Amino acid sequence: AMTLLDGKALSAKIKEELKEKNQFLKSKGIESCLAVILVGDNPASQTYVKSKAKACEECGIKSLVYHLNENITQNELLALINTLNHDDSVHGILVQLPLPDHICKDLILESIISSKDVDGFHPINVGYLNLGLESGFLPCTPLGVMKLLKAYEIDLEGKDAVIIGASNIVGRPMATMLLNAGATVSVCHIKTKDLSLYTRQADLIIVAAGCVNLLRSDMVKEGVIVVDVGINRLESGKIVGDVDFEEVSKKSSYITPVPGGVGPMTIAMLLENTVKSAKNRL
Amino acid sequence: AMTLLDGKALSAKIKEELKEKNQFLKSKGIESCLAVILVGDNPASQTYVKSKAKACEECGIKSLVYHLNENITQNELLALINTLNHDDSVHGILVQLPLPDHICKDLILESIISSKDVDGFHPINVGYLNLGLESGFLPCTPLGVMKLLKAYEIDLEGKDAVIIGASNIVGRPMATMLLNAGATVSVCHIKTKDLSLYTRQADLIIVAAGCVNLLRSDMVKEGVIVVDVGINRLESGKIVGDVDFEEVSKKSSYITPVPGGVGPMTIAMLLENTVKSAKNRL
Ligand SMILES: [Cl-]
Ligand SMILES: [K+]
Fold this sequence. Notes:
Two copies of one chain form a homodimer. By secondary structure, the first copy, chain A, is of the alpha/beta class.
C-alpha cells in the first residue's frame, strides 16, 4: 500500500485553524502580524513574498511587506530590522533570501530579535534546537516535514533516516529534529562518495538537493518513506521535485508529491510560528 | 600498520605552545584566568577539577576554583556566575559536571556569558557551530579530536564518518564539526536498530556511548580510523574506553588508546579556549 503525504490538504486545515485562533486573539486585542523584507526585484523572490502575503490574509495575519531597492546599504537594512525589533505590533520578522552580495546574510539574520525570528535562523534559536530544546523557533521547512509525518502517525524512533543536503535552511535542522525524535540520521551532500550506499538502507529519505531525478528506484528499498523538498521547474513548464516520483512511489509506503507536499507545509509553519509569537505576548 | 593517535603527546606540545603565548600575554598585562565552579563533594569531580587546576599551572593560566555547597540553591549559583561574568580579570568560566540533581544544567550553562564560555555549551555558541561559523567557542572534547586528527594529517573531506552517541557534550558537536569539514556523518545511539550496518562501512568511527566493548572487530572494516572517547572503569579499577582495543586496533590504520587518547586532548582544548578568550582582550 502506498500513501501520498498530502501537504496541500494539511496546510489548508492548519490555515483554517489559525484563522479561528486569530479571531479569538483579535477579540482580545492581539492582531498577529508578520513583517516580510524583500531586497530586490528578483522575479522568483517576489512570487514567494506574494505567496506569504496571500497566505497571511487567509488566516487573519496582518502582513507588512517591505520591497527595498537592490542598492540599499547594509546599514539601512539593519536600521529597518531594529525598528521592527521594537515594534510591539509586529510579532514576526522574515528576511527573504537571497540578499545582494554587499549585504552579509549572517549579520542580518543575527540582528533580528530572537523573539520574532519566525524563520528560526538566529544563532540562539539554532542552538536551542540542537540542544534538544524544541521550545523556541524552529525552521519552517523541517518543522513542516515533522508536522506532515505526525499527521500520518509516522513513528520515527529507530528509523534509518538519510538527509540529502546539509544546508542551514533544510538539511541541518532536519537531521537535528529527526535525531531529537530518536531516529538514526545520515547527512549526505555533494562530497558524499556513494549516495546510493546510504539511500538503499534508509527507512526515511529527505531529499533537498535541488536536482531533477536525483533519487531513483535503484537507490530505494521497498517500503521507504520519501520526503521531497525540491521545487524544480522543468523547461516544459511542469513543476517537479528531486525525486523520480513515477518510479520511486511504486516502492514507497509514504511519499510527498510535488507540487502539493512540503511546499505548502513550509508556508503553514511560517504562519504558525507567527501566531505562536503573537500568542506568547499576552 | 596501526598508528596510535597519541593524544597525550600532542597535548604536551599544545601546553608548551600555550606557555609561550601566556608569557607574551603577561608581557602585555594579560594574565589568562579560568574560573572553575565545583558544586558538591563528588569525589570524581574533585579529581577532575584538581587535574584542571594543575594543567592551568603547567601552561601559565591562573585558575580560580569556587567550591560551593551541595545544597546551594539555583539562584545562588546563578549569582556567582553573574559575578564572574562581569569580572574583567576572568576570561573563562567552566562549571564542573555533573551538577546536583536539584540544579537545572541547561539554565546554568546559558547564564554564562558567551564570551567566556570556554566549554562551548551556551546556545549561541552551539548555534554558531551548527551554522558553520568559528566565531564562537567550540566544545573541548570534539575540538580536541579534530586537532588530534589534523595533527596526523588525516583528510576528512568525503570520508564516511559514524558517531556513536548523541550527547550535547560530544556526539552532537562532533558530527557538526565533521560535517563542517566535509565528511558524510551518521549519528547512531541506543535506539539504532543495527549499529554494525553503519560501522562496517565507516572510514572513521567516533565512539562516545559509555559502554565497555561496544565497538568490536567484526563491526569494523580494515583501515578504519577509530577515536575512543569513552572513559570506563572496570571492576578491577582498570580504565578502558568504549572500544575493544586489542581486536579493533588490528584492523585500524589509526586508533586512539585509552588512556592517553581523547582525555588529555579535552583538557588541552579547555586551556586553549581560555588563552583564546584572553587573547581577545588584546
Ligand atoms: Cl529602498
Ligand atoms: K548530492
